Amino acid sequence: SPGIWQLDCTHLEGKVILVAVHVASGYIEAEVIPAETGQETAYFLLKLAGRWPVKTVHTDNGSNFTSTTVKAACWWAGIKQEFGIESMNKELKKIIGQVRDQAEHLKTAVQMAVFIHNHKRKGGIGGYSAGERIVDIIATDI
Amino acid sequence: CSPGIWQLDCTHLEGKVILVAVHVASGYIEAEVIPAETGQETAYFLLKLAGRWPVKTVHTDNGSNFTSTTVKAACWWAGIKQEFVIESMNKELKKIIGQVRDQAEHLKTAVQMAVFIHNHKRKGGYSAGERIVDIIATDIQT
Numbered sequence: 028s029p030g031i032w033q034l035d036c037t038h039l040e041g042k043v044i045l046v047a048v049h050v051a052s053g054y055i056e057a058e059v060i061p062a063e064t065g066q067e068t069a070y071f072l073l074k075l076a077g078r079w080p081v082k083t084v085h086t087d088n089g090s091n092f093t094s095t096t097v098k099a100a101c102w103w104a105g106i107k108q109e110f111g112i113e114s115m116n117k118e119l120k121k122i123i124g125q126v127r128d129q130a131e132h133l134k135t136a137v138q139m140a141v142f143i144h145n146h147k148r149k150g151g152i153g154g155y156s157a158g159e160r161i162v163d164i165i166a167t168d169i
Numbered sequence: 170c171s172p173g174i175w176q177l178d179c180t181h182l183e184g185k186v187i188l189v190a191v192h193v194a195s196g197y198i199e200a201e202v203i204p205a206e207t208g209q210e211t212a213y214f215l216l217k218l219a220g221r222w223p224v225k226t227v228h229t230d231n232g233s234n235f236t237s238t239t240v241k242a243a244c245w246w247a248g249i250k251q252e253f254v255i256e257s258m259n260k261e262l263k264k265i266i267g268q269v270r271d272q273a274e275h276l277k278t279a280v281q282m283a284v285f286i287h288n289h290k291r292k293g294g295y296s297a298g299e300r301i302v303d304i305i306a307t308d309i310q311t
């Protein structure tokens with residue numbers, strides 16, 4: 028189902044990175060957040076939901092994800108939370124390692140890695156990148 | 170017009186700076202309150218945008234944040250041509266901001282609520298969110 032996303036917090040360089048994956052496509056969005064809090068998580072989720080048609084979000088029982096602020100954002104946006112990507116975290120961290128030297132700050136490196144992940148040609152022919160896939164899948168669904 | 174073209178501009182509200190991106194072919198928008206009207210903040214926003222959508226060309230005015238070499242380096246890295254609608258989009262967005270404000274103390278949150286309403290709810294029978302995905306998918310498929 029094209030409305031399903033997984034969200035998770037992972038950790039690198041002593042910082043927190045919130046990762047969202049579109050399950051059907053493998054498309055990713057990620058951002059370094061100042062602290063592993065409900066407030067930061069809710070803002071991230073609200074931005075995500077204004078951009079893609081988000082219906083259900085699967086997370087673990089981490090305190091940021093079970094927070095009242097996240098519950099409120101999901102309620103406002105009409106998102107169903109399921110409690111309850113690890114390979115995605117691994118792939119994202121791998122790409123981060125590949126570009127890390129091209130930025131001073133991890134926050135910039137993370138966005139470079141998202142770009143690379145979503146846009147890189149897969150299987151030796153155009154049209155099968157994560158970013159091309161999510162667009163095709165969502166368009167076909169509507 | 171080409172599905173890879175976006176316009177970016179800054180607008181102001183309550184003494185804060187709001188960076189706005191419009192996908193020209195669809196009317197879809199992304200916006201965020203940014204800490205300062207700087208090249209660094211603009212470049213970060215643009216890198217995130219470019220990691221999410223296939224951005225080929227960005228139109229802006231000659232504001233110092235848009236002409237900065239940090240924005241230029243981001244465009245180089247991401248393969249984006251800079252060229253030096255949004256007017257009305259700014260007014261539209263501000264109107265919605267007032268309408269969602271009841272669940273948003275901070276303008277930061279309000280802005281994202283308004284983007285959500287603009288892209289998903291307004292149908293003026295497709296939403297801008299449906300249109301962008303259909304325009305881009307059709308481009309990919311051809």
Ligand SMILES: Nc1nc2ccc(F)cc2s1
Nearest residue numbers: 038039041042043062063
């Ligand atoms: N490596 C790690 N860094 C942080 C930073 C914050 C936090 F809450 C948990 C962790 S685990």
